[PDB]
User: Fold Immunoglobulin G-binding protein A from Staphylococcus aureus.
Amino acid sequence: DVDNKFNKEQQNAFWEILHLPNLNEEQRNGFIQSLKDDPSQSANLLAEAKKLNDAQAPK
Assistant:
């Protein structure tokens, strides 16, 4: 399910997903599902989100 307790650093990652202006809301969900599989690896996930933004290249 969902862990009532969270790490403050983890919260930072959640906001970055929201920031991605280039990406629509559905893409953001994809990161969340990954987070559930490996909460310890959320840091690893943090690096991946920035990379995806480049690919959309709305400009």
Notes: The domain at 1-59 is CATH 1.20.5.420 (Single alpha-helices involved in coiled-coils or other helix-helix interfaces). The two ends are 39 Å apart (CA to CA). The chain is about 70% helix and 0% strand. Residues 17 and 30 are 10 Å apart (CA to CA).
